[PDB]
Amino acid sequence: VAAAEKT
Amino acid sequence: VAAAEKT
Amino acid sequence: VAAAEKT
Amino acid sequence: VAAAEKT
Amino acid sequence: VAAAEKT
Amino acid sequence: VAAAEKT
Amino acid sequence: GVLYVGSKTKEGVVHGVATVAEKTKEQVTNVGGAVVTGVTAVAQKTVEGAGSIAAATGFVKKD
Amino acid sequence: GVLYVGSKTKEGVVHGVATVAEKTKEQVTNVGGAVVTGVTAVAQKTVEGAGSIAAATGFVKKD
Amino acid sequence: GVLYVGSKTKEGVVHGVATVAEKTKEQVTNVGGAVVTGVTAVAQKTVEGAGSIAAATGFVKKD
Amino acid sequence: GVLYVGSKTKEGVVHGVATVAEKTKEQVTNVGGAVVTGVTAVAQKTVEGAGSIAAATGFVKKD
Amino acid sequence: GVLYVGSKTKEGVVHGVATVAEKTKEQVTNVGGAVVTGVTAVAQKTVEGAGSIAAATGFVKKD
Amino acid sequence: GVLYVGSKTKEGVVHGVATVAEKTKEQVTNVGGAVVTGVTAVAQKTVEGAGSIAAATGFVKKD
Amino acid sequence: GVLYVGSKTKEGVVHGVATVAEKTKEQVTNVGGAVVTGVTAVAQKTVEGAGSIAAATGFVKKD
Amino acid sequence: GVLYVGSKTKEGVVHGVATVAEKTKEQVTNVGGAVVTGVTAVAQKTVEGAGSIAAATGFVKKD
Amino acid sequence: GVLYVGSKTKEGVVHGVATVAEKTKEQVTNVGGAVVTGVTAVAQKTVEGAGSIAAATGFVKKD
Amino acid sequence: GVLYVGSKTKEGVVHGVATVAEKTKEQVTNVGGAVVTGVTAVAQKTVEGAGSIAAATGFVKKD
Amino acid sequence: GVLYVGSKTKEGVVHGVATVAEKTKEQVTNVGGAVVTGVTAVAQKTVEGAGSIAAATGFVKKD
Amino acid sequence: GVLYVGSKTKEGVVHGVATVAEKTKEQVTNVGGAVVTGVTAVAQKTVEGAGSIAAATGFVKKD
Amino acid sequence: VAAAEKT
Amino acid sequence: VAAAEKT
Amino acid sequence: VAAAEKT
Amino acid sequence: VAAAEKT
Amino acid sequence: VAAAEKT
Amino acid sequence: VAAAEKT
């Protein structure tokens, strides 16, 4: 599981 | 599982 | 499973 | 599990 | 488990 | 477990 | 009399390569796969085994 | 009389490489995978085994 | 009489490499994977074993 | 009479490398993986064993 | 008569490397993984064992 | 007559390296992992054992 | 309001040049004259005067 | 309002040139004259004066 | 308001040049003249005067 | 308001030059003249005067 | 308000030069003349006077 | 308000130079003339006077 | 005057 | 005057 | 006057 | 006057 | 006057 | 006057 949001 | 959103 | 949305 | 948000 | 937020 | 926030 | 066996060969050689790459902006975005870029001026020899340059496999699943 | 076996060879050789790269902005974003960049002027030999340069595999799953 | 076996060879050699890299901004972001960058002027030899340069695997899962 | 076996070889050699890198800003961000950068002017030989340069594995999980 | 076995070789050698790196700002941020940077002018030989340069593994988990 | 075995070799040698590094600001931040920087002009030989230069492992968990 | 006079110009600029010259044998023989060779990657500006690059005059005689 | 006079120009610029010259044997023989060779990637600007690149004159005689 | 006169210019600039010269044998023989070789990566500006790079005059005679 | 006169310029600048020269044998033979070799990475500015780089004159005779 | 005259300029600057020269044999033989070799990474400014780099004159005769 | 005259300039500067010179044999033989060799990493400024680097004159004769 | 014989 | 013989 | 003979 | 013989 | 014999 | 014999 991986996540990488740019906001 | 992977995710990578740019918002 | 992979996802890659640009918004 | 990893996470890396830029806000 | 890892986390790395820049805000 | 690791955490590394820049605020 | 002289015998040459497998001799004076060149096998897997690169020479005399000039390269210029002006690129204002490069972006790689990779999710869950493999990406290979820019492999330049590479030379290889194998004996008795498989040999790969810049090969990519997105994933291997064998459940 | 002279015998040469496997001799005077060049095997896996790189020479005389000039490279310039002006790049104002490089970005790599990698999630859960593999990225390989910029592999330049590489030389290899193997004997009795597989040889890989710039190979990438995104994941191996064998549950 | 002279015998040469496996002699005077060049095997896995790099020489005479000039490189310039002007890059105003480099960013690598890696989550949960492998990233390899910039491998330059590398030479290897192996005997009786697999040899890898700049190889990347994102993960290996064998639960 | 002379015998040469495995002699006068060059095996895994690098010489004569000039490199310049002007980079105004480098950033590496790594979460939970492996990053390898800048590997320059490297030479190796192995015998009877696997040999890796700049190899990266993001993780190994075997629960 | 003369016998040379395994003699006069060069094996794993680096010489004549010039390098310049102007970098206004370097940042590494590492969380829970491995980062390798800047490995320069490295030479190695092994016999009867695996040899690694600049290898990185993010973690090994075997619960 | 003369016998040379394993003799006059160079094995794992570095010489003639010039390096300059102008860096206005270096920062390393490491949480819970491994970071390796700046490994320069290193030479090694091993016999009968594995040899690692600049290897990094983020952690090893075997509960 | 803004005025730019003679501004933001590029005037006599060279950048991003890669050149390789493998030449097994160069000979110059000069008797009583001028020889110019190899002028590479040269940039000049003059103001209020004649400008010459790689100019050759074999002799000037004004008895 | 903005006025640009003579601004943002490029005047005498060269960029992005890659050149390779393999020449087994070069010979120059000069007797009593001028020879110019190899002028590569040259850029110039002049103001208020004559500009010459790679000009050659064998002799000037004005007795 | 802002005025720029002669400002932000580049005038006589060279950057990002990689050059390699493998030459097994160079010979210069000069009798009674001028020889110029190898002028590389040169940048100049003059004001109010003649400017010359790699200029050769075999002789000046004014008896 | 701001005034820039002759400001923020670059005038006679060289940066980021990598050069390699492998030359097995150099010979210069000079009799009664001038020889100039190898001028590399040179930058100059002059004001109110003539400026020369790598200029050669074989002789000046004014009896 | 701000005035800049002749300010923030770069005038005659060299930076970031890497050079390697492997030369098995150099010979200079000079009889009665001038020889200039190897001028590398030189920067100059003059004001109100002529400026010369690597200039050579074989002789000046004015009897 | 601020006035800058001739300020914040760089004028005749060299920095960040790496040089390596492997030369098995250097010979200079000079009879009756001038020889200049090896001038490296030199910076100069003059005001109100002629400035010379690596200038050679074989002789001056004025009987 | 100039001359250049190869013999 | 110049001369350059190869013999 | 200049000369350059090979003999 | 200059000379450069090979003999 | 100059001479430079190689023999 | 100069001379430079190699023999």
Short mmCIF file of C-alpha atoms in Angstrom, two decimals, chain P:
data_model
loop_
_atom_site.label_atom_id
_atom_site.label_comp_id
_atom_site.label_asym_id
_atom_site.label_seq_id
_atom_site.Cartn_x
_atom_site.Cartn_y
_atom_site.Cartn_z
CA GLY P 1 12.40 53.21 -9.57
CA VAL P 2 15.65 51.51 -10.57
CA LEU P 3 18.33 52.24 -13.18
CA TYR P 4 20.72 49.58 -14.48
CA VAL P 5 23.62 50.69 -16.69
CA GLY P 6 26.07 48.02 -17.81
CA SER P 7 24.82 45.79 -15.00
CA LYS P 8 24.14 42.08 -14.40
CA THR P 9 26.23 41.35 -17.49
CA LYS P 10 28.42 38.36 -18.19
CA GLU P 11 31.45 39.40 -20.26
CA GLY P 12 34.17 36.88 -21.04
CA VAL P 13 33.09 33.86 -18.97
CA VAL P 14 33.77 30.13 -19.27
CA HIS P 15 32.16 27.54 -17.02
CA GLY P 16 31.36 23.83 -16.94
CA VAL P 17 34.13 22.47 -19.18
CA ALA P 18 35.19 18.81 -19.08
CA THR P 19 38.17 17.81 -21.21
CA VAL P 20 40.16 14.58 -21.57
CA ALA P 21 43.30 14.15 -23.68
CA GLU P 22 44.86 10.69 -23.96
CA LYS P 23 47.98 11.20 -26.09
CA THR P 24 50.55 8.40 -26.19
CA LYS P 25 53.29 10.65 -27.59
CA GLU P 26 53.58 14.42 -28.06
CA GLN P 27 56.64 15.93 -29.73
CA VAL P 28 57.26 19.61 -30.43
CA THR P 29 60.32 20.54 -32.47
CA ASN P 30 60.74 24.31 -32.87
CA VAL P 31 63.56 26.05 -34.74
CA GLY P 32 63.61 29.84 -34.81
CA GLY P 33 59.84 30.24 -34.57
CA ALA P 34 56.85 30.24 -32.21
CA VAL P 35 54.60 27.32 -31.24
CA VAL P 36 51.50 27.56 -29.03
CA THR P 37 49.73 24.43 -27.79
CA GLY P 38 46.88 23.34 -25.60
CA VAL P 39 45.31 26.68 -24.61
CA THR P 40 42.21 25.49 -22.77
CA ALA P 41 39.37 27.11 -20.78
CA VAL P 42 40.65 30.69 -21.05
CA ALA P 43 38.50 33.77 -20.41
CA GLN P 44 39.51 37.40 -20.85
CA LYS P 45 38.21 40.95 -20.90
CA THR P 46 40.09 44.07 -21.95
CA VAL P 47 39.14 47.74 -22.01
CA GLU P 48 40.98 50.38 -24.06
CA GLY P 49 43.48 47.90 -25.47
CA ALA P 50 44.11 45.11 -27.95
CA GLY P 51 43.66 41.60 -26.59
CA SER P 52 45.21 38.40 -27.95
CA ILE P 53 44.90 34.75 -26.94
CA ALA P 54 47.26 32.08 -28.31
CA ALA P 55 48.73 34.49 -30.87
CA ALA P 56 52.04 33.50 -32.45
CA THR P 57 54.58 35.46 -34.51
CA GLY P 58 57.56 33.59 -35.93
CA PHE P 59 59.88 36.59 -35.87
CA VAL P 60 59.91 40.36 -36.28
CA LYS P 61 62.80 41.75 -38.35
CA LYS P 62 63.20 45.52 -38.80
CA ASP P 63 66.87 46.18 -39.58
#
